[PDB]
Amino acid sequence: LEYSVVFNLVLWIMIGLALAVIITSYNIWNMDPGYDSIIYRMT
Amino acid sequence: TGLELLYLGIFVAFWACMVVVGICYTIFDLGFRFDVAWFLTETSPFMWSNLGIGLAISLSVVGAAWGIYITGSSIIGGGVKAPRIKTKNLVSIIFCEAVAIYGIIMAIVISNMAEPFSATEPKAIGHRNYHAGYSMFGAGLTVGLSNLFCGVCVGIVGSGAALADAQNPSLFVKILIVEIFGSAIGLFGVIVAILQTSRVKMG
Amino acid sequence: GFFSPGIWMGLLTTLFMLFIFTYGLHMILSLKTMDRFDD
Amino acid sequence: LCCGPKLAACGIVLSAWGVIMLIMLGIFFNVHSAVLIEDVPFTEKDFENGPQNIYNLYEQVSYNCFIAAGLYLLLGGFSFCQVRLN
Amino acid sequence: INPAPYTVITFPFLFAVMFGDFGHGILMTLFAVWMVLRESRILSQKHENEMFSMVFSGRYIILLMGLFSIYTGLIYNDCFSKSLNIFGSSWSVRPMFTQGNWTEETLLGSSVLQLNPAIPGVFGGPYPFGIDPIWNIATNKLTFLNSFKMKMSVILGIIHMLFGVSLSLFNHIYFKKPLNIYFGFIPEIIFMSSLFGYLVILIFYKWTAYDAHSSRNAPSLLIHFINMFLFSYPESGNAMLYSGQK
Amino acid sequence: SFFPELYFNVDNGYLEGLVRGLKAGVLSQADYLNLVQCETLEDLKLHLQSTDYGNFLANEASPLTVSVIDDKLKEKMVVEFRHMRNHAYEPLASFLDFITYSYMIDNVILLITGTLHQRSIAELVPKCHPLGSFEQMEAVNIAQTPAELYNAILVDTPLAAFFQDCISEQDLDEMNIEIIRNTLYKAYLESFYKFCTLLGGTTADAMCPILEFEADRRAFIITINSFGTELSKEDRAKLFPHCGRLYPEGLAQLARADDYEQVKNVADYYPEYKLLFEGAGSNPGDKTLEDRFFEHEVKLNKLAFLNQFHFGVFYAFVKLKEQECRNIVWIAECIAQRHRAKIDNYIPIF
Amino acid sequence: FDFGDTMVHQAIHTIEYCLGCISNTASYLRLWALSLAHAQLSEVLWTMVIHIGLHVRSLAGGLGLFFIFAAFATLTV
Amino acid sequence: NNPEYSSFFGVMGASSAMVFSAMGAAYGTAKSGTGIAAMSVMRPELIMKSIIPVVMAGIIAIYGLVVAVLIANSLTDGITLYRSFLQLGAGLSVGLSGLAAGFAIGIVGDAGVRGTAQQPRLFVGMILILIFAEVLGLYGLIVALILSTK
Amino acid sequence: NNPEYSSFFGVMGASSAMVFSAMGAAYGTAKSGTGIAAMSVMRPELIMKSIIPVVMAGIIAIYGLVVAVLIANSLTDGITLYRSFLQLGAGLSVGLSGLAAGFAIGIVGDAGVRGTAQQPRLFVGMILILIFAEVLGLYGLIVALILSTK
Amino acid sequence: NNPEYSSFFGVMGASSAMVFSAMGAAYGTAKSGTGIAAMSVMRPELIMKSIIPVVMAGIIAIYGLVVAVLIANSLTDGITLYRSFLQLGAGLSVGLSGLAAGFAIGIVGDAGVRGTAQQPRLFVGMILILIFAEVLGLYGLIVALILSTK
Amino acid sequence: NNPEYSSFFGVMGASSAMVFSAMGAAYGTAKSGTGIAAMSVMRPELIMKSIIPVVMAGIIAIYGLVVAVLIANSLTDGITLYRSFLQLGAGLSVGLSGLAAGFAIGIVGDAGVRGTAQQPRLFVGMILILIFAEVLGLYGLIVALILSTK
Amino acid sequence: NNPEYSSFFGVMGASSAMVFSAMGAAYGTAKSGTGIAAMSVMRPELIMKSIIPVVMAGIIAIYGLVVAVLIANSLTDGITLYRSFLQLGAGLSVGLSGLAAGFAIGIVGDAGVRGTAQQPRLFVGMILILIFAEVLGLYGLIVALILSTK
Amino acid sequence: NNPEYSSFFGVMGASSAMVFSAMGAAYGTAKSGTGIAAMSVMRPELIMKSIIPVVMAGIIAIYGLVVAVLIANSLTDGITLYRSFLQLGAGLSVGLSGLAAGFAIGIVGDAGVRGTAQQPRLFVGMILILIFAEVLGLYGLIVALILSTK
Amino acid sequence: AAGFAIGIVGDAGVRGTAQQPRLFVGMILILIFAEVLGLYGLIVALILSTK
Amino acid sequence: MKSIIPVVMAGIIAIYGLVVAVLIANSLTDGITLYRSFLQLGAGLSVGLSGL
């Protein structure tokens, strides 16, 4: 009952969650550890 | 390119949801639930007037910003060894400022025709209010985007001419005329927007 | 229906505004720095 | 010489084949009276009195093939004349 | 086994049935004979067009091909999208259809069509002159021609495959290799003969057996074939094409 | 193109203007007529001081020599390139890093076998070709240890990635230095081509053809040359770069080639460089095959200059400036030699 | 006598032979597709170009039929 | 009768008609506008010949004008919502035709101006391909004209 | 009996029909023009032969227009509910067919132009491919017209 | 009194079927043209042999043609609303299966291109793998027409 | 009696104004600060005159509090739904106008500081560009003041 | 006349405020920390002059946190929903202005650390920019507090 | 009477706190640990000093647990819809604040261990940045607590 | 998150230990920290499974 | 010639979808029970993507 604004609220929460999880997934998939000056010893 | 790729991801997701709901609209017998007439009758011209003015100024300003930077950096990079360039090439910045001026003139012309309504009933109330608001954000969209495009074109061609000046300054005589065409694009947007405001009123 | 149109006005208009600001943000972050100077 | 055979042989072939099939089509429009199995199209909007005026139309439309065949024959004659210019 | 004496024929007819057009075949043969006439001329003639060289090198193909194409167009009664009126149509007359409890629906027919249900009692029967031209007008001709052409194409393919595979026997006997016969050729003929000759006899039997009067509850060959292939046999709800076929 | 202009100009206007202006900064043809008309080294100083170049012979030896002319041309080149590379940005900076890595591998092969042999490393410093930089450590004062340089150059020096192919410390002695340089040149070149293709804009469009030309021409010249050496055809195909039209076809005929005529036929498969073949007069007082190759390079450099939203303009300036230095020092050489019948081995660029 | 290799040889040959027989019997239907193609293109081009020969014109019908006729003739060939 | 605020679709049609022509003509005067400047240093004698694409991009903008002013002229309060749809379709069509034309003009003009910079005799053929670009723009215009008068 | 304003669908149909055709035409023109603009210096005798693909793009543009004007002739608010979306479907059909034709013609023009630049004889095969692209466009028109009149 | 908006489950089905055919075929010609330009610079005797994949670039257009005009002819004023869903199915089915086939045909065209540069004998294997591709399109035609008659 | 959420829109107007102003100013400081931080190793004497871009960025900053406080102290809950939307639009427009001004100014500052670093001559024209950027920001402001009460 | 769910606006305002404060602080600290880590290798004495940005990142944290506690001080279930509007707007708004600030600070710090390596007097310019942009942090905070109390 | 989901926004607060805290601690641990394992090669005698950033990564995770367990202890079926929103904001707040703190901690820890691999004196500045990061984490903790009990 | 950190620190530490066997102990400890994060996750999971 | 066998397995992937499509065509009718049609949907999706 009175869904007409609570569904908008759920939409806002869901897009906030999507933004956060997307940012973290982008920065965690593509984290930049340096990976230098010793990588040749292990290759 | 990952970030813009995620932007395209949300784009395609939005369109996917759109097609899904569009089909399910007629699958499950949704009886004209998206009443477009309800939407139009229930909207307000305050959105439309303020959109017109704000978008006009917005887009004129950012177009002028583009022109300002491209011309300015081209000129000061060229002047490092050929300082004579600026003495003839600084006028392009005045020109993009004039583009912004045209946009602002449209902004005031559109501000000429904004007023409150404070009415509740939609039916037969404010019939021409809708018409005038439609005209208003139409004019704002037109002016703003036209000024964007004049700005980018003027900026890049100005940079090209500015660093062509570096080798032979006599070429500035037969290259500056390019800006006239973009100015025609600006004054065209002005004419169409004037006609948009010419025969409109809120009632 | 299936929504509240009263705030749906603000929703769609604000979404247009945030799309324009999204273009603005793509351009504002398009900045990126330079290397050493020439001397 | 002028308008050699290398570019008029096409006109010759086209004219000959055209006269052939238009005489066949005129024969099928005036003798068969353009039976509908062979020719559905017809130019009337009111035929509720009888089939006689539809027959008159069948001769009318078959009349249109005579001018066709005759001036294709003229074109073929002119093409032969162009060819003979050697 | 040189396959020239078999391709030399079957390639023509298969192009011709894939090219079932009368006047187009006529034009193709006209061009082919035009090349035939000037053979000795072109042999003492120098040109650079190499597609033209590959075609007059293979003129013996195209002339015979075009002859069979004309003949196939004669089958289909399709000379430039039209049919020749032999006037053997035996489908409808005035007193018959009015005698089928009908009259003056053509007053309302200005907006409608009114397909006639079959079995009038006096019409039908064979058309010796090929395809009856009446279909060319009917807009439901698609169903008739689709079923027809699909079935004959499948059967022609079956016949060609079954004939062509038999040359492996000539190979096996000429080279005194019955080792390729024992664990080879024989089961091959077995499975193909069963799997496709069964379908052939099925369609022949259906065409010879059932009429439009028994159209209700009439099965289809598709459903029978898939039921056989799937191991699925319902206990009822679908009558056999013949007794004991399970 | 589609992406640039709105984004090119923002961070490339300065460098585009700079390459245009420094194309204009080369010696004018009137200056060249001044160069040939003095036939003396003191006057050579006199009028090079009066042009864009010159005014750089201060604090130099009173007996002006040709080597000084070479040094000043090369100093102008390296100064202009330090000017361009100092101001750069990750894509184009990386591009210019590639432009420099060729000379890097050259100088690095100069450094190697200065330490397998018992020679000083301070001895090596003044002899490096310019642009070499080598401000990075672990390669200096190595105590004449091959493994120390091996690890120094896998670890510290930026071009270590290409030495993943040159490994095991065995090739240092058993194998030639020059063949090692050739493997590194190939591997680096193909890596550069792949980097160019990754940036799929007009950069890729303008840099693909010239890299294919360079691969094709180097395979062409090397195939001509090694008819008088000890090398088999499969080890031969091993070291031809993959990034060339030849790899589709033309490299096979070069492998089959054994003399001047098979390679002539290879040139004849492609009209573009057949023309470069028939310009191989090699006459005493004219240009040679290598000069026609440099001429075609010059033409492609002009073609790169025509376009303006890519990065091949800087490579074009590289090749043109190298040709220009070759011209000016050659003129100085023939002025000192006093032999005016043989001044003609230089290619004016602009 | 390589038992395994020859066994696999015969196995692949039988598998491909049977499955190819099935796929080839399916592929024969291209005949049907092409026959449909010839038919359909014939009547559609007829109803498009040469159908315009019908018109109420009593004198200029054939006269325009000239270029209409040449048009479909070159097109159809 | 005329339903409530029936004008809307035409009110947006004029805007679309002019603004998408603003994208096409702007790109057209951008591309050649920069390429001509790049060429001018080497040889200025062909500069006015090379200007030809720019004014033609202006002509694309003029097509936009004609459609827009037609829509505005027919724009009134008593709109049947039939002509409003006609105007919207016309504006979108002509605008995006101008966009396609502007892109083709810009790229072909840059390629052509540098090509003629290398060799003079290609100028007229360059202008032929450029004329074709305007032919496409004209088809866009005439479709919008049909809709504005329906 | 008929839902009102089915003619909007025909309006958007004619629009889309010329839209996607114009897109394809611009795509073909850009590529072909840029391709010739380089190599007319080295093979100027092929300048006359180079017109063959661009007029093919022009045929695509023509096809866009002819469908647009057909739908305009058949457009009316008094549609029986069964003829306006026909215009919509046919317009989308033919337009994007023109788009595909422009794609193929432009890229094949790029490949074949340097093909003939090396060796003059390759022209005939190139023209064969151009013929095929046009055959595709023709099929698009066939089905489009069938839906247009039915 | 059939439901309103009924015939368009036929119209859009036909349109979409030929839409995807148009995409697939054009991509086939794309890759074929690039490949033939590559081959014929060095192997002229293989030109007309490499024209062979080009003819199979067109069959994707032929299959979609068949299905499209079958749907067109079978479309009527009022539908039973059980055949039109079959038309939508079959259209999308054959169209996108053919688009996949067209991708495969273009790229295997490139494969045989790079194949026959040294050894003309590979022509036979090229054609063989090429036959393996269009069988999918014919399969799609099979199921599409089974639905169109179901 | 007024529709709900009336003050909410004014609060967003203030928020939009100040955000875009802060974004532009932070951009200006970021780019100018990198330029000044790294350049002054070689020409330290320009350090006391590079504050001009910094205070120019500050002035682009300042356009916030004027409009933002005009909102903050003049905002109420009893609005007729007309004022609040005006403040929303005005805040947005002036804000992102200032954002664009800063987008120009920071990068102008870096390019300018390097330019004057080479030679002191270009400094006057560089500052000329900066003042034009401030004029742009002021345009945004004056329209904001128009919408404050209009 | 207060719609329910009013606590949501206030809590999300305070949340988003300290959220964005933490984000900006992390940016500044992380950038400056990498800089100072790679710098004290060769001049340890610069630590006392490279840690001021850390202090001012702390100051931004204090900004977000005073905002958070202040908003929390005026929160309950049945708020009027007219003050919570300001709470939400300001809470988002000041915090994201802090993002802009601290991001610019971290960039300028990355540059200034390397700037002051060989030339100690650049400390003055470093601090000159550093105080300035944090005054812009305050700039935002002013409107933050004014609306938090309005 | 009570709106739906009114006893569950706190559940998602606890969830989000755990989410963003786990992401943060994991990222910081990975980033610092890479550098730690790098500099263990040449200086294993400082591993214990380089354990310290990982210890505070654990500690900021403990902050996340304090919020999570308190929220779990402050949940039941009959919530009045405002403590639930409070705990939602609290949990997401603290979680992502710990996330950004862990980001900064990790990257600065890698840089710091790189730097201190030549000089253990840099440990003092490393600890200075490090502690401040958990000060930020503590601030997020404090706001989460006050909201969870408000 | 725990597995993510565990994998990265483990790869780094096992690579580092490929030169120095001592690192093994410290590497394992760095992993222990992430498994303590896992402990936290299971603790709250237990709370909500018995709530 | 012996490297065609993976292509034969590709043809087998082709016959698969046809088998299932014929099954669906069999069990399809006009007024389906409304709980077989989704089974057909899922079957087609599953077999087709497994073929993928």
Residue numbers in the entry:
A (entry chain p): 599 to 641
B (entry chain b): 2 to 204
C (entry chain c): 413 to 451
D (entry chain f): 5 to 90
E (entry chain a): 389 to 634
F (entry chain d): 3 to 352
G (entry chain a): 712 to 788
H (entry chain o), I (entry chain n), J (entry chain m), K (entry chain g), L (entry chain h), M (entry chain i): 6 to 155
What does the published report state?
We then performed subtomogram averaging and classification, yielding three well-defined states of the intact V-ATPase at approximately 17 Å resolution corresponding to about 120° rotations of the rotor subcomplex between the states. To achieve higher-resolution maps and resolve the binding partner better, we collected a large set of cryo-electron microscopy (cryo-EM) projection images and performed single-particle cryo-EM analysis (SPA) of the V-ATPase. Refinements resulted in maps of the intact V-ATPase assembly, again consisting of three states all at 4.3 Å resolution and a map of the V0-only V-ATPase assembly at 3.8 Å resolution. Unexpectedly, the cryo-ET reconstructions and SPA maps revealed that synaptophysin is bound to the synaptic vesicle V-ATPase. Moreover, further supporting our findings, the V0 domain of the synaptic vesicle V-ATPase was associated with synaptophysin in synaptosome preparations. Together, synaptophysin is the most likely candidate for the binding partner to the synaptic vesicle V-ATPases that we discovered in our in situ cryo-ET and single-particle cryo-EM studies of ISVs. Starting with published V-ATPase structures and the AlphaFold2-predicted synaptophysin model, we refined atomic models of both the intact and the V0-only V-ATPase assemblies in complex with synaptophysin using the wild-type ISV SPA average maps. The luminal parts of subunit e2 and subunit a form an interface with synaptophysin, and electrostatic interactions are involved in this interface. The interaction is identical for both intact and V0-only V-ATPase assemblies, suggesting that this interaction does not appear to directly regulate the hydrolysis mechanism of the V-ATPase. Comparison of the structures shows that the V-ATPase structure is not substantially affected by the interaction with synaptophysin. The confined membrane environment of a synaptic vesicle, including vesicle curvature, probably contributes to stabilizing the relatively small V-ATPase–synaptophysin interface.
The synaptic vesicle V-ATPase is an ATP-dependent proton pump that establishes the proton gradient across the synaptic vesicle, which in turn drives the uptake of neurotransmitters. V-ATPases consist of an integral membrane V0 domain (also referred to as Vo) that functions as the proton pump and a cytosolic V1 domain (also referred to as V1) that catalyses ATP hydrolysis. The V1 domain comprises three pairs of subunits responsible for ATP binding and hydrolysis, and its activity is coupled to the rotation of a central stalk in the V0 domain, mediating the translocation of protons across the membrane. The V1 domain reversibly disassembles from the V0 domain in a luminal pH-dependent manner.
